[PDB]
Structure formats: structure tokens, C-alpha cells
Amino acid sequence: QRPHVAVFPCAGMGHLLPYLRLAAMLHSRGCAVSVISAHPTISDAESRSLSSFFSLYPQIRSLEIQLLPDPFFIQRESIGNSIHLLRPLLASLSPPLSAIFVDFPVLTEFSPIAADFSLPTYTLIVTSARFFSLMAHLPRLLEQEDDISKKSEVCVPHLDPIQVSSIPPQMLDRRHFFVETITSNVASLSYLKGVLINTFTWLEPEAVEALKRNGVDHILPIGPLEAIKAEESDLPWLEEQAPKSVLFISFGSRGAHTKEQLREFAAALEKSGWRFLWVLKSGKVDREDKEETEDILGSSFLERTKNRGVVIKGWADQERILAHSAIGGFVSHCGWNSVVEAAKLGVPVLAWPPHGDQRVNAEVVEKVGLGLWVRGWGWAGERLIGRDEIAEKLIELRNDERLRERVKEVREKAREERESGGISETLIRDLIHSL
Amino acid sequence: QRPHVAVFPCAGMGHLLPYLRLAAMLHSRGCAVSVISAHPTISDAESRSLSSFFSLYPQIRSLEIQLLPDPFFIQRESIGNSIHLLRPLLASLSPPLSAIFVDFPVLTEFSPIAADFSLPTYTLIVTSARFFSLMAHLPRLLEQEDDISKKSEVCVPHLDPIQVSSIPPQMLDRRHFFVETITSNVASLSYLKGVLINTFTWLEPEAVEALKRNGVDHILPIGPLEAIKAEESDMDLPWLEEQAPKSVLFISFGSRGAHTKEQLREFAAALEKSGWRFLWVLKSGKVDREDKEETEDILGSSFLERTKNRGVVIKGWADQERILAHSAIGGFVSHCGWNSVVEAAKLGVPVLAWPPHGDQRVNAEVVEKVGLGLWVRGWGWAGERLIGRDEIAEKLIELRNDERLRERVKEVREKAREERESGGISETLIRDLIHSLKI
Numbered sequence: 001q002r003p004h005v006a007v008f009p010c011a012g013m014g015h016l017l018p019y020l021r022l023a024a025m026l027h028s029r030g031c032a033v034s035v036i037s038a039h040p041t042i043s044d045a046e047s048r049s050l051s052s053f054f055s056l057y058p059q060i061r062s063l064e065i066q067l068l069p070d071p072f073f074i075q076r077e078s079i080g081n082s083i084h085l086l087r088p089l090l091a092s093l094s095p096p097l098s099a100i101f102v103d104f105p106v107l108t109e110f111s112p113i114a115a116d117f118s119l120p121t122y123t124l125i126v127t128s129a130r131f132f133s134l135m136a137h138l139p140r141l142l143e144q145e146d147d148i149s150k151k152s153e154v155c156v157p158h159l160d161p162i163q164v165s166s167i168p169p170q171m172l173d174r175r176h177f178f179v180e181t182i183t184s185n186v187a188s189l190s191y192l193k194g195v196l197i198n199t200f201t202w203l204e205p206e207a208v209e210a211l212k213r214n215g216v217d218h219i220l221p222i223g224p225l226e227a228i229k230a231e232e233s234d235l236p237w238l239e240e241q242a243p244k245s246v247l248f249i250s251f252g253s254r255g256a257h258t259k260e261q262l263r264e265f266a267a268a269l270e271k272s273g274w275r276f277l278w279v280l281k282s283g284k285v286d287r288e289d290k291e292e293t294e295d296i297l298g299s300s301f302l303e304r305t306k307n308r309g310v311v312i313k314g315w316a317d318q319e320r321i322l323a324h325s326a327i328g329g330f331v332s333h334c335g336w337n338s339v340v341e342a343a344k345l346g347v348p349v350l351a352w353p354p355h356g357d358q359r360v361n362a363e364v365v366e367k368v369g370l371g372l373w374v375r376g377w378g379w380a381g382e383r384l385i386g387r388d389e390i391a392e393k394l395i396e397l398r399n400d401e402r403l404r405e406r407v408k409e410v411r412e413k414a415r416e417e418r419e420s421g422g423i424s425e426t427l428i429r430d431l432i433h434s435l
Numbered sequence: 436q437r438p439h440v441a442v443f444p445c446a447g448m449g450h451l452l453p454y455l456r457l458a459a460m461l462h463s464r465g466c467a468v469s470v471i472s473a474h475p476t477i478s479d480a481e482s483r484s485l486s487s488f489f490s491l492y493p494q495i496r497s498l499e500i501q502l503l504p505d506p507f508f509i510q511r512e513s514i515g516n517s518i519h520l521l522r523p524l525l526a527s528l529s530p531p532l533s534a535i536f537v538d539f540p541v542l543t544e545f546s547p548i549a550a551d552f553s554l555p556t557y558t559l560i561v562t563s564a565r566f567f568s569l570m571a572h573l574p575r576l577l578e579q580e581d582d583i584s585k586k587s588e589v590c591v592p593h594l595d596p597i598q599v600s601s602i603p604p605q606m607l608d609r610r611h612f613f614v615e616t617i618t619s620n621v622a623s624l625s626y627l628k629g630v631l632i633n634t635f636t637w638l639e640p641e642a643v644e645a646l647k648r649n650g651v652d653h654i655l656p657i658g659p660l661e662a663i664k665a666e667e668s669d670m671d672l673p674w675l676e677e678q679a680p681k682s683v684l685f686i687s688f689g690s691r692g693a694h695t696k697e698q699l700r701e702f703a704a705a706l707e708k709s710g711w712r713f714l715w716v717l718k719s720g721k722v723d724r725e726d727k728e729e730t731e732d733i734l735g736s737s738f739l740e741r742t743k744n745r746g747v748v749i750k751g752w753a754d755q756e757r758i759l760a761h762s763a764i765g766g767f768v769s770h771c772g773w774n775s776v777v778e779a780a781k782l783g784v785p786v787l788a789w790p791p792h793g794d795q796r797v798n799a800e801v802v803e804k805v806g807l808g809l810w811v812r813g814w815g816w817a818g819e820r821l822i823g824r825d826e827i828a829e830k831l832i833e834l835r836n837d838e839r840l841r842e843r844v845k846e847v848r849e850k851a852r853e854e855r856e857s858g859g860i861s862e863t864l865i866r867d868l869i870h871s872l873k874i
């Protein structure tokens with residue numbers, strides 16, 4: 001017999017994928033896994049990825065909740081309201097779960113269910129240790145009035161200061177619901193058996209140690225998460241390119257920028273001379289609402305770059321593309337999942353964080369030597385950054401010998417961690433044993 | 436929970452694989468899938484593919500119908516005869532199918548079964564939109580008094596006129612069953628929820644609009660279909676790995692054999708003349724692998740010896756989609772069956788078109804419009820006239836040297852890539868059908 005565990009992401013591709021990856025890592029290491037999904041999904045992509053995952057992993061079981069009656073936050077509240085639907089589902093499981101992994105946002109709401117069933121519950125953090133360090137200190141931080149206006153930096157104990165320019169404004173307003181969501185779930189970490197984070201110690205040593213010293217001693221640096229597998233099968237344009245010559249661009253699972261800004265970047269691509277594969281979601285937040293068809297970049301750019309660039313509109317297999325030998329650079333939005341994959345695959349990064357914790361994730365990218373970053377660009381829409389400025393960075397990414405060498409080291413280190421003797425691997429095996 | 440759907444192909448690799456591809460496509464996308472096959476299969480390959488497919492996809496399920504005791508056509512007739520055998524099978528099935536996809540030929544014969552079962556039914560059309568418009572217009576066309584052979588062209592409504600030389604004589608002749616098959620099924624096209632075609636709008640914008648106008652507004656352009664999972668043998672791989680990129684010509688004249696030995700020899704001589712490196716997949720053919728006793732009594736020893744350095748000839752079946760995908764492949768000499776054209780368009784391989792039978796000549800007309808391939812219309816149906824080595828050799832040289840073609844094929848590939856994107860019509864249409872297909 002082998003232990004049964006369930007994994008439960010609330011919303012977003014950024015949350016969902018790591019959990020699907022965690023579930024596959026658990027299945028590979030000897031556990032029976034159930035993935036719990038809340039329906040209907042806000043986007044086609046999470047729903048499509050869930051269907052795709054189940055076909056790829058027949059052994060993993062699908063548990064679904066139908067939800068009773070800005071969008072991702074609303075979905076988080078929908079799950080919190082409908083969290084009681086999990087109770088009949090957990091009791092029904094053929095072999096009971098010895099563990100469940102639930103998303104950080106629903107830990108408070110799920111706290112009673114964990115108590116009634118006496119079920120050990122852990123959590124997988126999808127953001128950086130440094131941003132998570134700030135999240136844990138937020139309640140103590142909000143006790144003092146010192147972050148309201150005259151604050152250049154916030155000092156989280158045991159790590160160097162976080163400048164206030166990299167902290168999302170909603171996090172610093174007590175009235176805002178975002179603070180309430182973080183403040184409740186942070187208290188809810190006390191009942192967890194462990195808190196899994198998708199980072200490793202040598203990538204973030206001060207931050208991992210800062211969490212342990214600041215009230216999170218069950219933190220487990222389990223990163224990087226392994227790739228979801230796929231049946232082997234655009235390879236051809238990529239296949240036809242010389243190694244290290246192609247720059248991959250993604251601004252996330254959602255659109256980041258204004259058309260004028262994107263066009264400013266695009267001109268920059270041309271000036272740089274990089275061959276590129278670019279994945280564009282100019283649909284803002286939802287797959288379903290995105291109906292634009294390269295109306296964002298204009299026809300002339302496609303005509304001019306037709307030989308040396310491919311623009312994929314919508315979803316792409318980003319991790320799999322990153323793996324390809326042709327790729328030589330990544331222009332990332334600095335979401336922790338993408339940043340970690342760049343670290344894993346040793347791809348040099350030009351960091352362009354637009355919203356949320358991505359500015360702090362960019363700080364980590366710069367600190368480890370994984371990529372180049374300009375703090376002055378700021379949050380999306382604050383400033384217009386011109387072709388000439390962007391191009392200079394693109395040209396640097398190409399030419400920085402040191403960066404390429406440092407990136408290789410990040411990759412070596414990332415590899416060591418998922419090896420048998422590795423800390424991340426040791427820690428997961430240690431947890432599975434705890435059964 | 437998942438919708439349970441079934442895919443039913445009747446006969447021939449050209450039909451079977453596309454259904455197998457659709458079935459796999461449905462499975463990745465949240466469907467519980469069964470494949471219905473008729474036994475005994477006409478060819479070994481058909482049998483080989485089915486058995487292999489199930490091993491590759493354990494989750495997909497096999498439903499077999501045992502059959503009471505030209506061949507491919509005969510087999511289809513047999514299937515229509517044994518069509519009742521389904522009724523126990525559909526009844527047997529748990530969970531019940533949300534929808535079923537059945538091949539174009541037996542649409543009428545399955546019509547009763549669909550109605551009784553109150554089961555929504557679909558077709559996958561394995562031919563081009565351009566040929567299909569001709570098939571949907573055929574019933575009206577026969578009604579037209581002037582017999583088709585006398586007229587130089589036939590005008591389908593809203594379509595570029597189709598030249599009669601491009602239309603198989605069997606289609607224009609009333610006595611022939613083939614006419615009875617096309618006309619019957621077309622009429623059964625009204626009971627279906629949708630008709631799915633392995634093409635996309637860019638590839639054929641006029642033909643798809645015409646189908647919508649001409650009484651098939653439930654057509655869905657679902658192309659190109661996705662590639663099936665593979666065995667990945669490390670045996671037919673080595674010569675291809677050795678060669679430089681884009682320097683190898685791949686030749687395949689179909690699932691089945693196409694041409695006379697004299698004709699094949701004409702082409703084989705031409706091939707030496709071009710100077711292309713090549714991979715030729717050869718089949719004696721007629722219709723059946725089982726009956727193909729002869730091996731390289733078609734080409735002779737001398738040719739093989741001379742070209743040994745730069746050529747490989749494979750006799751029998753090969754995994755063509757995998758080969759075309761290879762870095763080494765630089766051109767495709769094709770019979771222009773639709774499944775093959777799409778793979779070339781989808782994979783961006785330049786085509787010299789040589790269609791010998793059936794809708795293949797119409798398909799070649801599409802390859803030409805698209806800029807995917809080079810075609811000579813004058814060559815005619817297979818066996819009509821011998822085409823000389825020099826004439827073939829000239830076309831082969833052009834394939835090598837045409838820079839512009841290279842540009843267009845690349846453009847064709849991009850267009851294919853787009854249809855496979857998440858927001859693309861082919862994906863949207865398919866996802867929508869699966870969503871709507873709940874109950």
C-alpha cells in the first residue's frame with residue numbers, strides 16, 4: 001500500500017501548474033494522488049491543462065467541486081464560500097488521504113475541515129522566499145504606521161530591506177482585501193505540517209533562513225518543481241535555428257502591457273537583432289475575453305520580422321520551449337514559476353516585472369546573477385520605456401559573457417537539488433516517508 | 436466525468452488514421468473515447484495500426500465489429516451490410532455515448548441507428564474542402580442534362596470552376612456505385628450535428644465558404660489534425676540522421692501502390708538525374724500488402740547500386756509524418772491524398788505534386804493555389820500516358836532550386852501553426868463541440 005494525498009490549487013495558471021507538477025512529483029515518488037479542481041474554471045487554459053494532465057496521468061484521480069453562485073480574486077472567494085463541498089468528497093476517498101496540499105489563499109477557510117477530519121495539511125507556495133518573507137511579516141509590519149507614506153524600504157527581520165517601490169500598493173493598505181487575505185492565511189500556517197516553497201537554499205539562502213527565524217520553521221525548499229511530461233511532438237521553426245540564438249518572450253499567463261508599450265518593445269527587438277519566439281496574450285486577464293489577432297503589434301512588424309521571429313498568440317508550452325537548444329534568452333514578467341524554470345534550464349533573463357510580487361522576484365533574479373534588470377521601468381503603465389532603452393538591455397543580454405557563465409552555475413546548482421542527494425529531493429522523500 | 440464518444444472509420448489508411456488522430460485529439464481534450472473498427476481488416480497495415488494504437492493509448496478503447504463473410508470499396512459495402520451489428524454494441528456500451536463520429540460512406544446505413552438511439556452524430560471528412568464541394572454538388576450536377584464529360588469545366592456554386600479532367604470519370608458516370616455512394620450520403624448530411632473537415636480556412640477560404648452557402652453550413656474546419664503517438668524505432672533513423680538539413684527528398688505515392696513499373700522506372704531514372712539525396716517509400720500495392728509478393732522487381736538491381744551512396748528505398752510501410760518532420764527532409768513528391776498534403780503544409784515541406792487517382796487531382800489544385808507545391812496538370816491520371824525521365828527530372832530540379840516556393844511553404848506552415856493556437860478557429864471549434872457535447 002502507498003499513501004494517498006490530495007493537491008488543491010484555487011485559481012490561476014500560476015497556482016495550478018505548480019500543483020499539477022507537485023502531484024506528478026508525489027506520484028513518481030510512490031504516493032497515490034488526487035487533484036481537486038474547483039469548477040467552472042475562470043479561464044479555458046486551466047480547464048484545458050486539467051483535461052491535458054488527466055490524459056497524461058491516468059493513475060492520478062480527478063476530484064471536482066462545482067462552485068455554487070479581479071476575476072481570480074472573485075474565484076478565490078467563490079471557493080471560500082463553497083469550501084464545505086470538500087467535506088463529503090474527503091470522507092468518500094477509498095483509501096483516506098494521509099496528507100492534503102491546499103493553496104495558501106484558502107488555508108483559513110479550510111482550517112475547520114483539516115481539524116474535523118484530523119488530516120495533516122501542508123501548503124505549496126508559488127512565489128519567491130523573499131516575497132513570502134515579506135508576506136509573513138506583513139501583520140507585524142502593519143502594526144507600525146511607518147509603511148504608510150514616508151517609507152523608502154521595509155525591513156523584514158533576517159534579510160536585507162525590500163524597497164517600497166517593489167511592494168504592490170494594495171499590500172500596504174490595511175483597508176484593502178488583499179491584506180486581509182494574506183494576514184489570515186499567514187496565521188493559518190500554524191496548523192500546517194509543513195509549508196513547501198518552490199525555491200532552493202543556494203538560490204535563496206538568506207530568505208529561506210529568514211522564514212525559519214521569523215515564525216516559519218516548517219518551511220521546506222522543495223524547488224525546483226519537475227516538468228509535467230508530454231507525449232513528444234512549433235518545433236520546426238525552432239529546430240531550424242542555430243543553438244542559443246533565439247530569444248523567448250513571455251509576459252505571463254496573462255497580458256501585461258499597453259499596445260503602445262508592446263510596440264516600443266517590438267521595435268527594440270528589431271534593433272537588437274535577436275531572433276525571437278514571442279508568446280503574446282494581449283487579452284489582459286481572460287483567455288475567453290481575448291479576441292485580438294495581432295492587432296496589438298501591427299502588420300508591418302510581422303512583415304519585417306517574418307524570417308527571424310515567430311509570435312505565438314495565446315498559450316504555449318513555455319517550459320518545453322525553454323528547454324530547446326535554440327533558446328538563448330528569456331524576457332520574463334518575473335512570476336516565480338517562470339523565473340524558477342529559467343533557473344532550472346539555465347536560460348539568461350532580461351527581467352521586466354509588471355505587477356504583484358514580480359518586482360521582488362526580479363530582485364532575486366538580479367541577486368543570483370540569473371538575469372539583467374532595470375528597477376526604473378517600474379510597474380506596468382507607470383512609464384513608457386522606449387525602443388532605445390529596451391534595445392540596450394537586449395543587446396547586453398546577448399553580449400554578457402559573465403551572465404552566461406553565472407547562469408550555467410545556477411543550473412548546475414538547481415540540478416544538484418533535484419538529485420538523490422539533494423536537499424530538495426531529500427526533503428520531499430523525507431515528507432513522503434512521514435506518511 | 437467525461438463525455439463518451441466513439442469514432443468509426445470504414446476502410447483504408449487514408450480514412451483510418453485521421454479518425455485515429457481525431458480520437459487522440461478528443462482524448463487529450465477531456466473525452467472518453469472508443470474506436471470502432473470492422474474486422475477482418477482489408478490490409479495488414481490497417482490491422483497493424485489499430486493494434487499498435489491501443490498499446491500506445493491504453494485509455495482509448497477498442498470496440499470491434501466482426502464481419503459476416505475495389506477491395507476497399509467492397510469492404511465498405513460489406514460494412515453497410517453488417518451495420519446492425521452496432522446496435523447490440525451501442526446498447527452494450529457503458530457509459531452511453533454523448534456523440535459518435537462515423538465515416539462519410541456509411542452515413543445513410545447508420546442513419547437508422549442514430550435515430551433510434553437519439554445519439555448525436557458527426558462526420559470527419561478526410562478529403563479537401565474543394566473536392567467535398569464537388570461531392571456536395573454532385574447530386575444537383577447529375578440532374579443537369581448536359582452529361583459532364585462533354586463540358587470542359589464544372590461550376591460548383593461560389594467556387595473556382597473545377598476542370599473536368601480533374602474529376603474522376605467514375606464520379607461523372609451514373610451507373611457507377613461510386614456515384615450512388617456520394618449522392619446517398621450527402622443527403623444524410625442533414626441529420627448530422629456537424630461535419631468536420633481536415634482543412635483550415637486560410638488553406639481553402641473559397642471552398643469552405645462555398646460549402647456553407649451550398650447547404651453544408653454545419654461544416655467545421657478542424658484541420659490540421661494532430662499527429663498520433665509513435666513507437667520511435669532507432670532502426671529507420673540512421674541514414675536520415677547522417678544527411679544535411681533540407682537535402683533529402685522524400686517520395687511516397689500513397690498508402691497503396693500507384694503507378695506502372697515502366698512509369699516508376701521513368702521516375703527512378705529521373706531521380707538519378709536530379710541529384711537529390713532521397714528517401715523513397717515504395718509499395719507494389721494494387722490494394723493489399725498481403726498480396727504484394729514482388730520486391731524491387733520494379734526497379735532493378737542496377738539502380739540501387741548506383742544510388743546506394745545517396746539514396747534509400749524502403750519497401751512497405753513507413754511512419755511518413757515522422758519522416759517529413761525530420762531536419763533532413765527537403766522536399767516531398769506526393770500523390771496528393773489529402774492527409775498527406777496537410778502533413779506537408781503543417782510541417783512546411785515543399786511538394787511536387789503527382790496525383791494518380793480519385794480526388795487526388797483536385798487536391799493537387801489546392802497545393803498549387805497555396806504555393807505549397809509544384810504541379811504539372813498535363814501528367815494526367817495514373818497510367819494514361821507515360822511521363823519521361825527528362826520531364827520528371829526538370830520538375831525535380833525546380834523543386835530544389837525554387838527559392839520562392841521555399842518562402843511560400845514557410846508561409847503555409849505559419850498559417851497551419853496559427854490554426855493550432857489556443858484562440859484559433861480549429862481549436863475553438865473543437866473545444867466548443869466538446870463543451871456542447873455534454874448531454
Ligand SMILES: O=c1ccn([C@@H]2O[C@H](COP(=O)(O)OP(=O)(O)O[C@H]3O[C@H](CO)[C@@H](O)[C@H](O)[C@H]3O)[C@@H](O)[C@H]2O)c(=O)[nH]1
Pocket residue numbers: 012013014015017126127250251252253254279314315316317318319334335336337338339341355356357358361
Ligand atoms: O504561455 C504560457 C505562459 C505561462 N506558462 C506557464 O505558466 C507558468 C508561469 O507562471 P508565472 O511565471 O508564475 O506567472 P503568472 O502565472 O502570470 O503569475 C502569477 O503567479 C506568480 C507566481 O505566484 C506570481 O509571481 C504572480 O504575481 C501571479 O500573478 C510557467 O510555469 C509556464 O510554464 C505556459 O506554459 N505558457
Ligand SMILES: O=c1ccn([C@@H]2O[C@H](COP(=O)(O)OP(=O)(O)O[C@H]3O[C@H](CO)[C@@H](O)[C@H](O)[C@H]3O)[C@@H](O)[C@H]2O)c(=O)[nH]1
Pocket residue numbers: 447448449450452561562563687689690691716751752753754755756771772773774775776778792793794795798
Ligand atoms: O508509408 C506510409 C504511407 C502512408 N502513411 C500515412 O498514411 C496516410 C495516407 O493518407 P493520404 O496521403 O490521403 O493517402 P491515401 O490513404 O491514399 O488517401 C486516400 O484518401 C484520401 C482522403 O479521402 C483521398 O484524398 C485520396 O485520394 C485517397 O487515395 C497519411 O497519414 C500518411 O502520412 C504513412 O504514415 N506511411
